Each structure stands twice: as C-alpha cells, then as structure tokens.
Amino acid sequence: RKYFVAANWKCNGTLESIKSLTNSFNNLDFDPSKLDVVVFPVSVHYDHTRKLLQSKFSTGIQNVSKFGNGSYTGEVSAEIAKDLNIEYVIIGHFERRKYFHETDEDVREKLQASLKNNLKAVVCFGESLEQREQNKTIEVITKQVKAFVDLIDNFDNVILVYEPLWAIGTGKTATPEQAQLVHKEIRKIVKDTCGEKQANQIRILYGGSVNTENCSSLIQQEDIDGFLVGNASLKESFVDIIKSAM
Amino acid sequence: RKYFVAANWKCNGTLESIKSLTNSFNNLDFDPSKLDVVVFPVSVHYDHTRKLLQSKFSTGIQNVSKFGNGSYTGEVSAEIAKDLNIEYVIIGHFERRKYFHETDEDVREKLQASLKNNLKAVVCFGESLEQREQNKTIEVITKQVKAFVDLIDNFDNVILVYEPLWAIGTGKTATPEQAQLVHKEIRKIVKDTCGEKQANQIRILYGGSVNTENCSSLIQQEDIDGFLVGNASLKESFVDIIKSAM
C-alpha cells in the first residue's frame, strides 16, 4: 500500500507566495513511485502551481461539480478537469458540507462523475464533537461511507480521508490511537461492502491538525496511510511531513 | 452609457475548443474604449483564455467567494482574484441561486468583497415564472436589487443583469418591450436609492437566450445596455452579437 501525503491549500495564496513555497517543495528529494505527494491549490492557481511544481508532485483541485458540462455557472465539471489532465479531486470536505450545503448525496454524484471521467478522488468525511460525545462516531462514519462506497471500482484511484470535524483547524489533533481505531473501522466497512482485497489496498488518510511534531506517530499506525494537511501545508516545513511518510 | 457584451461560457469548453473559439473572436476588430466585451471562462480555464484572447477583450470569473482568505476549501476569494488581476466577476447568477443555495445575503457579501478588492461586478437577478404569473415581478426585482444596490460606490464598476428565469437556456427570449419595462424599473430603483445621475450611468443588461437574431432588437431599447450571453457565446457567431452593440 502506497502512502499518500496531500496538501490542501484551501482558499490561500498569491502568485509570489506559491512561487516561494513551490520552490521549497521542489528541493525535497522523494521517489514518486514509492510515495504520492499531491498539492491542491485554488482553481485559478492551478496552472501556475502545476508549472512550478516538479513532476514528482501530483496535482488536483479542491472541488469538482456533481453536474457534467452544461448550464452550470461557477462549476468545474469532471470532464473539464480530465481535459486539463488534472489528476485528483477533493470531495466531501467539511467546509463545503458546513458552509455550502454539500450533502452525502452531493458527494456520491461528484464521485460517480469523477470516476466515469477517470479522475482520482480524495473523499472526505468525519463526525462532529456532539456526535463524538454521543458515541455515534461509527454510526455516522458508516452512514457517510455507505453513501458512496459502492461506486468504487478501482481502489488505487479512490482515497478516503477521516477528518473529525473537531480536529480541523482547531489544534485538537486526534491521538494516533483514536485515529487508528476509526481508520480500522473504516477499512472494516470497505471490507464488508466491497471485499477484503479491496479494503487492503484503499488508502485511508487522517485529516485534522497534522503538523511536523505529530505526523510521525500518526503515520506509524497500521491503518493510517497518509494525511490531508491544511494549515501546515502552507508552510515550508511541509517537507518534513512528507519525510515522515518516507 | 458604454455598452457591455458579456460571454458566459458556464460549465463548457476544452483546451482545443477555447483555442478555436478565441481565434475567431480575435478576428473581430472593435474599440474597447467604446464597448466592453468581457468573457467569463471556467476558473480552471482562466489563464488559458486570458493568454489566448487579445488585450481588447476583458476577462472575469463566474463566481467569487463571500469569504476572504482562510479555511474555505473550494473557494476563490476576491483577494485572490485581485492578485491574478481578474477584472470582472459574476454574482447572483440564477444557476447558483437555483442549485447552490445562493441567497440575497450571499450576493450582498460577494459584492462587498469584490468592491473592497477593486473587482468589477456583473450582478444578476430576476423573477421566476410563478412570480411573473402572480404579478410579483416589480416586487421581486425591487427586493433583489435593494439587497445590494447601496454598496455601489462606482457606477461604471457594477453592472446589473435582468435574468427572467423562464428565459434562461429555454429559447424563451423576453420580448424587447417586456425587457425594456423591467430595465426601466431597475433604473428607477437605482434612481430612488443612489441618485439620478448614478441611475443614468449604470449599465443594465438583459440575460435570457440572446442570439444573433434577437440581439439587435433588444439592444435598441433605451434601457438595455447590453447582454449576458449564455449558449450563443460558445459559438464563433458570437462576434455578430458584439456587432449589434457596436
């Protein structure tokens, strides 16, 4: 199983700051055949980011439309992304669920669109603090995964992300034990719906306050296959988070 | 009043089709000081489109964020647009109101963010068939315009678009006289809220299946200052629509 370190830049960056950050990223020597390292810039920053990044870095966009080509103002379809050779897409991110009415149904329609246009999908899910405190974590996770999991045909092409909503941008990282326990359950859901071989090859990443100090102990866990990094991926020390997966 | 013809490509285009479309667009000789011609490609096509089109053509994006920079995955902020020197933005388009929960509040906050970052805004609104059949057109138009109109500090930099919802992508073009009556009322709404000189300065465009056949009859109305064009702007014959406003 190949590790997967993703940089979700979110709504951040200038042409110059990206030039500077992309320069520090390029200095890191890593084998792209052994490790996947993906950068997700803002849509309008993509060409600039792709030009500057060495080919060892994979690239993608932070959102993809549930609709194909047509009368949908403001949307980036899956077929448009494929034409531009954009390899990866993020689907079901907490912030889009929270601020932009993105539901479990939107998630699967985005996945189905991405898969039939041969795009690789990074699919996000996680429970809130209330759901955690009500002991509903697995119930919520199972519900969120089952929404889309049947669509997966190639299990190298779909990458799952457990992002506990209370851990995102708060500094309250889930302990490598807490993350591992949910990751192990996620892999069990994939096993019982898709098969053991399909479960053993799918990457399940952790998202939620990954930094340079906690990344090593997180990646060491048997069912954690990498990270979706937010704030720390905006920093030059993001190379050290990639180093933890080497 | 300087006429304004806008191409809304929506969720359409490949690299090769844009190359072919921009090449035919570039052949049309027009004076950008006499007429504003703006094209709005998909966010991921922006750099490609901007490079291909000659400097006489203005460009913009189909949507801007209500949020500034920060943890908002999938968003394009007004600060980011400013840094790319993206001149124009579309706000409040019917499709984003219909499919993506965009409200009058979102429209207000997007316009405020755009003007703060020195972007020019193409702001869309319009009544549905049911609202028109209930004779609520003036009431709905007034409510939609009043949601944002007080934010306008420069009346060359904000451009209004009347989108009768039943006319969008349907071939149900509102008759020149029907459109004129609304445009005239929109100008009066801008008169009572912003002043007379500002009302006579602001551009109000028609949006609703404009083509090469109906464009000249629409542009000839005294209160219609141009168009936001959908599907017809994906054709090489879009140059003839520009010609009717020359």
Swiss-Prot record, chains A, B:
CDD domains registered for this protein in UniProt: TIM (cd00311)
Gene Ontology, cellular component aspect: cytosol
Known catalytic reactions: D-glyceraldehyde 3-phosphate = dihydroxyacetone phosphate
Listed EC numbers: 5.3.1.1
Any Pfam family the entry gives: TIM
Database matches in InterPro entries: Aldolase_TIM (IPR013785), TIM_sf (IPR035990), TrioseP_Isoase_bac/euk (IPR022896), Triosephosphate_isomerase (IPR000652), Triosephosphate_isomerase_AS (IPR020861)
Gene3D superfamilies registered for this protein in UniProt: Aldolase class I
Keyword annotations: Gluconeogenesis, Glycolysis, Isomerase
GO annotation (BP), single: glyceraldehyde-3-phosphate biosynthetic process
An example Gene Ontology molecular-function term: triose-phosphate isomerase activity
Record: active site: H93, E163
Pathway it works in: Carbohydrate biosynthesis; gluconeogenesis; Carbohydrate degradation; glycolysis; D-glyceraldehyde 3-phosphate from glycerone phosphate: step 1/1
Keyword Amino-acid biosynthesis in record: no
Domain of life: Eukaryota
Subunit and partners: Homodimer.
Described purpose of this protein according to its UniProt entry: Catalyzes the interconversion of glyceraldehyde 3-phosphate and dihydroxyacetone phosphate in the glycolytic and gluconeogenic pathways.
Similarity remark: Belongs to the triosephosphate isomerase family.
Protein name: Triosephosphate isomerase
Gene: TPI
